[PDB]
Amino acid sequence: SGPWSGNAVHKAEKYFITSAKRDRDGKLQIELVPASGRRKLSPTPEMIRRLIDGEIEIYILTTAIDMNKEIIDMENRYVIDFDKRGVKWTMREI
Amino acid sequence: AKKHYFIIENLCVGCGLCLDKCPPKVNAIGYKFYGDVQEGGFRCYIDQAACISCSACFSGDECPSGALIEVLPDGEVLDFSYTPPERLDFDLRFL
Amino acid sequence: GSNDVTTAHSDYEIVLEGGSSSWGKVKARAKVNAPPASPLLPADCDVKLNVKPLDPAKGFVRISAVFESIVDSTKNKLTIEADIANETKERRISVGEGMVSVGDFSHTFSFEGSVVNLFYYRSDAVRRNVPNPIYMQGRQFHDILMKVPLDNNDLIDTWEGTVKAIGSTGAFNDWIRDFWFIGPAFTALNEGGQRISRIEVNGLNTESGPKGPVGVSRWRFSHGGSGMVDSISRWAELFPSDKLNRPAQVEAGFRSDSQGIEVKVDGEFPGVSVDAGGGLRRILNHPLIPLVHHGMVGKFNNFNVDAQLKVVLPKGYKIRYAAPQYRSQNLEEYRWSGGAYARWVEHVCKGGVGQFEILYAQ
Amino acid sequence: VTTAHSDYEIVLEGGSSSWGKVKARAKVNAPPASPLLPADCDVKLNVKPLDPAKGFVRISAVFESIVDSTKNKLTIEADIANETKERRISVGEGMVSVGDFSHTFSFEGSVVNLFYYRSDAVRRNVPNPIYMQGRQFHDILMKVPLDNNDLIDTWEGTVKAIGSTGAFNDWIRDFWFIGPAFTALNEGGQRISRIEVNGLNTESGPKGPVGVSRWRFSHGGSGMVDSISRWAELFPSDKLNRPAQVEAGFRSDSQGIEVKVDGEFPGVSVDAGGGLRRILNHPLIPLVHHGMVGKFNNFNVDAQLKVVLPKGYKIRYAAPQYRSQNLEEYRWSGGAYARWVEHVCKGGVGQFEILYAQ
Amino acid sequence: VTTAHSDYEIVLEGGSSSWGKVKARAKVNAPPASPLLPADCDVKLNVKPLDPAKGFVRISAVFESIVDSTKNKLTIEADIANETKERRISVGEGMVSVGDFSHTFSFEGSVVNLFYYRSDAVRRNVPNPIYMQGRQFHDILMKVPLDNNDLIDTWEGTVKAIGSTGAFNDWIRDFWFIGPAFTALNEGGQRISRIEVNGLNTESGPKGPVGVSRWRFSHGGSGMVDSISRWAELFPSDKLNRPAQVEAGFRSDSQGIEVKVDGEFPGVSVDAGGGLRRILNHPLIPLVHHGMVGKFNNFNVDAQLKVVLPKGYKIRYAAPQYRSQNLEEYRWSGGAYARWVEHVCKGGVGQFEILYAQ
Numbered sequence A: 001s002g003p004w005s006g007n008a009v010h011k012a013e014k015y016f017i018t019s020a021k022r023d024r025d026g027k028l029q030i031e032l033v034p035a036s037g038r039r040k041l042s043p044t045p046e047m048i049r050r051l052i053d054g055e056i057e058i059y060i061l062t063t064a065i066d067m068n069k070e071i072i073d074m075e076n077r078y079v080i081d082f083d084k085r086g087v088k089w090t091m092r093e094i
Numbered sequence B: 001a002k003k004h005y006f007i008i009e010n011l012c013v014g015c016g017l018c019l020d021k022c023p024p025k026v027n028a029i030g031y032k033f034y035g036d037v038q039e040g041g042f043r044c045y046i047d048q049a050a051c052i053s054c055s056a057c058f059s060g061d062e063c064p065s066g067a068l069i070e071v072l073p074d075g076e077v078l079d080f081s082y083t084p085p086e087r088l089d090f091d092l093r094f095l
Numbered sequence C: 001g002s003n004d005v006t007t008a009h010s011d012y013e014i015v016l017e018g019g020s021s022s023w024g025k026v027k028a029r030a031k032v033n034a035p036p037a038s039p040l041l042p043a044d045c046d047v048k049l050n051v052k053p054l055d056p057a058k059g060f061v062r063i064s065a066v067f068e069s070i071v072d073s074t075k076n077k078l079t080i081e082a083d084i085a086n087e088t089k090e091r092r093i094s095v096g097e098g099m100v101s102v103g104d105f106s107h108t109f110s111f112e113g114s115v116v117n118l119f120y121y122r123s124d125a126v127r128r129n130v131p132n133p134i135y136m137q138g139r140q141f142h143d144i145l146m147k148v149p150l151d152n153n154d155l156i157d158t159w160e161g162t163v164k165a166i167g168s169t170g171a172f173n174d175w176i177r178d179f180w181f182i183g184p185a186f187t188a189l190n191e192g193g194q195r196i197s198r199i200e201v202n203g204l205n206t207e208s209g210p211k212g213p214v215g216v217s218r219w220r221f222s223h224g225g226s227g228m229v230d231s232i233s234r235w236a237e238l239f240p241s242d243k244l245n246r247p248a249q250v251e252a253g254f255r256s257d258s259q260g261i262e263v264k265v266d267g268e269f270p271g272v273s274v275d276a277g278g279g280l281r282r283i284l285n286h287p288l289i290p291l292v293h294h295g296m297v298g299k300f301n302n303f304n305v306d307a308q309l310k311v312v313l314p315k316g317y318k319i320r321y322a323a324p325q326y327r328s329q330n331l332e333e334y335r336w337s338g339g340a341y342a343r344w345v346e347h348v349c350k351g352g353v354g355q356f357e358i359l360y361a362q
Numbered sequence D, E: 001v002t003t004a005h006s007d008y009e010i011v012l013e014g015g016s017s018s019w020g021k022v023k024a025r026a027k028v029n030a031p032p033a034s035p036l037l038p039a040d041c042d043v044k045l046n047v048k049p050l051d052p053a054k055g056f057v058r059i060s061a062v063f064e065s066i067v068d069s070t071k072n073k074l075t076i077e078a079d080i081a082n083e084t085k086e087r088r089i090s091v092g093e094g095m096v097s098v099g100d101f102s103h104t105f106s107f108e109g110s111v112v113n114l115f116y117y118r119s120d121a122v123r124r125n126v127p128n129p130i131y132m133q134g135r136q137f138h139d140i141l142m143k144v145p146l147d148n149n150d151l152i153d154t155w156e157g158t159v160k161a162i163g164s165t166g167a168f169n170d171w172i173r174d175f176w177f178i179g180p181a182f183t184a185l186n187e188g189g190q191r192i193s194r195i196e197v198n199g200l201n202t203e204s205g206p207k208g209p210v211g212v213s214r215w216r217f218s219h220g221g222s223g224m225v226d227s228i229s230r231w232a233e234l235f236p237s238d239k240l241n242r243p244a245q246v247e248a249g250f251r252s253d254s255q256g257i258e259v260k261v262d263g264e265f266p267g268v269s270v271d272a273g274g275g276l277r278r279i280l281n282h283p284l285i286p287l288v289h290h291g292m293v294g295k296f297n298n299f300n301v302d303a304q305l306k307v308v309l310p311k312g313y314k315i316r317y318a319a320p321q322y323r324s325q326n327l328e329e330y331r332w333s334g335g336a337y338a339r340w341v342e343h344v345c346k347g348g349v350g351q352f353e354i355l356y357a358q
Ligand code: BCL
Pocket: C049, C050, C051, C063, C064, C065, C080, C082, C084, C092, C093, C094, C096, C112, C113, C114, C115, C142, C143, C144, C223, C231, C239, C248, C249, C250, C268, C269
């Protein structure tokens, strides 16, 4: 959409994964928090369908290694279920 | 204290405005070159063992790439201290 | 000196068709610098209504509707798509499905509905002494069977809570009307002239389906009117199944904010002009429910008015008895602006229901 | 702009009398909130003392209107008496005609008014009570001759509806108050109970069958309803020693409204205690009911109120102030009076009180 | 013209505190919609922490008014505690005096608030919910000493009415909400259920017989009702670590209205997520209720909202814009703020939101 709606830095609404707790299911606790940080969402296949098209991007915050199905190259190729590969940001202070 | 700040590596451009506000007794912000500084090869970083959570780095609203985040004390991640309300738009023509 | 300015810029157009046809194109623009009475701002919305003739033998038509809105940093979407037919002239049948999504949550549904409209009287003197009846009291009865697949945890939670509430309390049938019409809507119900009866639940079931359990509910309710309700008094006008020989559309959108309101409307559909007896035709009588409902938000800021109404007729048609007067006749077009038309516009933008009638002939 | 030109006059009588003459003119350039225009109407209200021993008085009323090329007429004529101070008896007849259709009727009615309390502290601490909650009960027996085909059709349809459905008693209120009237019912402060039908009969008469119906209903108020809170003021059977009249007419159109009113009747001025008298407290139902149509166009205000007193009477504590005293007359115009007029022409119920003495 | 002069101030506190000082002045030259004028009133509300272990707090309230040459006084004083997060307990007493009549009472009450749903999606997709439908249940046991003749008369009349009529339970709502209040009940969004009487007794006491009554009623809302939708916000038992006050007074007349308000209490600012705080969402019941008297005279508007923040706090996303920043203060006047003030003084509920951070 227009540059003046939301944040001007990003081309679409950005999300981050913040929680990775294991509750009898491994990775039920995917907590999609938006850039503005007022909600705590989940995979929620509606979120997945709006991800796959053009509108959602998610990142992993180097601060669920296999339970989120890392595949095999460049130390990062995180995929959620089968379709889209959530890119990740790095924050290495060392 | 709480609410660390965590410069993002991949988005930083090295403008250094984040480094100015940090008090001189606290040199928590530094530089990393690893290459030629014209195609983006001098991105900065934050030392977590010296930072004292001033918020001068986040509350100043200076980062142009959204590289400062200020993660909240519990789990929440910010990117800028306030975001416009994301409306959506069209064109009009008074006939 | 005097009070607030708050100009209200609006632009209207009607375009008709000749012969015995009743189709029409409608266009509308609007602008105000007044804060909307929404306790959450900003708020934006787009609406698409489309309809096409499924088949004329049965009388079945197919109608779709899509709603998107952004209400204070929250995306809402509602899709519905259905098939409707008049089984009699006072019974109507519908089979459809849709979904609703808010933020991340979303769920689909499929409904199966019938509606019956009844008038309180049928006296023919009312039909031979009054040429243009307006108020007509009656009552509508809705019978609905809807199925929703239960796949989310929250859907199952809502289902179990509803079953427990329906089992336990004896006043569910009438207290449900409190949750039903959320906020100011409820108040309008009294004033807008309507009366909703207590719902009657015929059984809540759950059955295994394609992917899992599905909650099936069927229920009946009724609502009566003193004549102001269009869905009752004008049951025949609002579903013109005859003239839908080609697809029709309605397509609108408003965008509100902390400093005024923006409006944009297109449309093309039959039923715009109706026979008025003696060879003359007329624009349809203006619906009253939208006027009185909008009158509950249009009294908060005194405003200045400027508008065009621009009506385009086919070949050989003339407007006679236009009240208030028009201003110009560009040989096929008639334009209304300022004066008594402006007064009438200010009157109807506050809930007034005064009649502005147009008769045209050939 | 929409100026609103209005002209008022009150004329009183001296001594212990309470009679008064009322005159009113009005003009607006605003479209009436009528979904059928134009609309015209005249009203005649006459009353004469039938006889004072019984307390019986005779009252007539005639209505003609032309509503969008349709002539409507309603005549009613009746005899009323106060059997007690909280029961009233009435015997009357009339007819209604629309276009070509017409039919007569004869009614036989009683009304009982009851207040929810009678505490005398409310009577010794408040000098001018306003709100007074209560309930009215109407018992009606009306006979209508069935001679037209349409009358017989209505009768048979009504009998079938009353027999078949179990929710006739409460759904009849939907047909009863047609259109916006129903809405006012909630806001104007009233509550209509479900009617109770005591039997629909048909009996042979002079020219043919006659439908006889008798039914009862009740309506309560929170105090705003004048017919309940002021049951004693609205039927002054004492001072009707000569015929009285009320005679009005409005004539609406697509561009403003015309009004014309004459009247002469008792009850205009009442005792206020301590030797002072006052104009009667303004009724509230007309104000709040007209407030539902008076908010559609902002308007400019100009008016006269011109009050003429008898010999030796003086106005003291007139709020807002008057402007002139032409040695017997008092005139109100502009300023706070204009503000109050604009206030009450939109549904406001602020008090404009006049006290006069001698 | 009818200018409306008003003056507002909010003063906040820093840290995690939520306390605040509120100050307000107001003036209009319009006649109040009171069928009795003049009318004056003062209100004192005080509250102090009885003890934090139990959560019990003590709250007092005093009302004096002069309504058309009649002094009215109402004193109430009570102890309140949250027994659960959806049940509340109260023990209190008071008195009411009108003119010369006066009587005391002691009540014993519990209130239960229930929401119609608890869906957590509504909690993760909407950041700032506004409308929330629910229902409240009140259980009251009140004792009044019968010492006056009029008290005994009221008691006997009430016993007779409760015994005799079968429609007391629903007709009591007519006497309950006197006058226009009843009408607001429909529009303001509320629904009062029929009361249910659990027994009227009379027992000997210190000086004589005492009438004891206990009764239950409920009222539901579509979300507009604050007492239901915001059950948690209106009784901040946590931050009451020092006495708080609310102290207001209006003084009406036949030519405009005067207002004067002081206050200091917690709950003025609430967390808004992401480190930002906000002024609490404006209550809706006062706005829509005052909108029923604010449409009678078109008026001119001038006002000045002046918000004072603590050290290091900044306002961001103030809609509409402010006009000045005197290094700690923010001032709103004219323009869109004036339009919003005129909007909300007529019943509008548009949102004027302020977010501040540090
Ligand atoms: C609004 C006043 C009455 C109402 C009046 C009607 C009327 C009248 C009808 C129904 C009908 C239906 N109603 Mg209902 N109904 C109401 C409240 C409800 C509620 C509820 C929870 O409150 C429910 C669940 C229903 C359910 C239903 C289904 C049983 C049925 C088909 C709906 C439809 O096709 O969807 C499709 C949804 C829409 C298209 C949304 C758009 C609605 C607006 C009003 C359309 C505006 C038309 C626009 C001005 C011009 C459009 C022209 C374009 C060219 C198409 N009604 C209210 C109380 N209802 C229909 C029926 O008979 O089914 C047998 C029907 O004709």
